[PDB]
Ligand binder design. Structure first.
Ligand SMILES: C#CCCCn1cnc(N)c2nc(Sc3ccc(C)cc3C)nc1-2
Length: 208
């Protein structure tokens, strides 16, 4: 069963701005997603100190970057805390409302899109390079879910019967036709070195 939801109007507006604004420095999307993965890993690590059983779903804390030219996808995988159904449907978007308002005010005052992460809404920068984003996620004590959106004001959530992932999040970027440079090994390596060189978890760049 696939459920369809409307984004909050403010989030739809943010996504439209990201898609419509002329802005060449698109590569910053990767730093934003890696940053989110790092935060998710920090969270499960912290929680595990008081409840060690939270790592029964996997002790390894890391990030994988997986390009696939045949599917035209770049996947950012982490073994962090994951997300609940409520996270996906309501709670992350609700929190994102304040950051969105502040971000759009800052842009009018002279800020640029690269600063999106300073407002806590960096996830949506995925739409700089992706025509569709699929998020597969598994949180302890909740089921595995697939969230998906091609923007246009709506997203879907379903229980995922695909390959079980243990715990964490996979952000699958279905790249725009003119953004296939982000499938190239040399390009991803360059971006990770430029913007994500001090992340406190292993980042493995898979090759094709
Ligand atoms: C980190 C932190 C913990 C919070 C949950 N969470 C966990 N792991 C990730 N890799 C996340 N990326 C986001 S941004 C985001 C915002 C909205 C939607 C719908 C999806 C995502 C992935 N949120 C994430």
């Amino acid at each position: 069963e696939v459920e369809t939801f409307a984004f909050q109007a403010e989030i739809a507006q943010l996504m439209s701005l990201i898609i419509n604004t002329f802005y060449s420095n698109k590569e910053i999307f990767l730093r934003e997603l890696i940053s989110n993965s790092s935060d998710a890993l920090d969270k499960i690590r912290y929680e595990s100190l008081t409840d060690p059983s939270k790592l029964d779903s996997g002790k390894e804390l890391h990030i994988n970057l997986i390009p696939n030219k045949q599917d035209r996808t770049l996947t950012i995988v982490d073994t962090g805390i994951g997300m609940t159904k409520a996270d996906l449907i309501n709670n992350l978007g609700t929190i994102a409302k304040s950051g969105t308002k502040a971000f759009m005010e800052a842009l009018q005052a002279g800020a640029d899109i690269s600063m999106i992460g300073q407002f806590g809404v960096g996830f949506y920068s995925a739409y700089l390079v992706a025509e569709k984003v699929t998020v597969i996620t598994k949180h302890n004590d909740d089921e595995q879910y697939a969230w998906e959106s091609s923007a246009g004001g709506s997203f879907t959530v379903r229980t995922d019967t695909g390959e079980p992932m243990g715990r964490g999040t996979k952000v699958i970027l279905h790249l725009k036709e003119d953004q296939t440079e982000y499938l190239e090994e040399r390009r991803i390596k360059e971006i990770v070195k430029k913007h994500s060189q001090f992340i406190g978890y292993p980042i493995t760049l898979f090759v094709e």
